[PDB]
Amino acid sequence: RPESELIRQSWRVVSRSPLEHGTVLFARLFALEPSLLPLFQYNGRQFSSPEDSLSSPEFLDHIRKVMLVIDAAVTNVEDLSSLEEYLTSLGRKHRAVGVRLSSFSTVGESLLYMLEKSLGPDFTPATRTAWSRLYGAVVQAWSRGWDG
């Protein structure tokens, strides 16, 4: 489908350097919602500043995991069911770590922000809309983790 192609094609560029692009995503995320910072608790320690997170190997590893889940959604765009059980569990895991379902809308905004800045002129409003649909679909699946 044309919309599925809009997603695939846009993802191609940022998929080539996932850590660099995911770093933009998480920098934007903390700027928008600073209270997400303390939810990373590697070695039982809290990051004081957002820039502290960027020196942490485990935090950077987590960026790679996020970008790989998104890549999975892109491979399955139009095939989004295939991932429902995995997303529900991933959702439950985040509830357990203390992320509120609401904070995932901020994640969506950060993903769209990162795509916009990476695509520039290529970020057509059809692509913003398509990604909004895809992300909306990911979030619904995700949400089931919170039991509603």
Ligand code: HEM
């Ligand atoms: C609100 C933003 C988020 C916070 C605060 C957050 C926090 C965490 C924490 C603390 C862990 C466990 C430690 C670790 O594995 O490094 C984790 C695991 C993980 N997260 Fe995130 N996360 C966030 C968003 C996301 C998003 C958007 C994705 C993917 C779309 C994602 C994918 C993962 C994956 C794949 C794991 C491994 C889970 C497992 O199998 O154990 N997270 N999350």
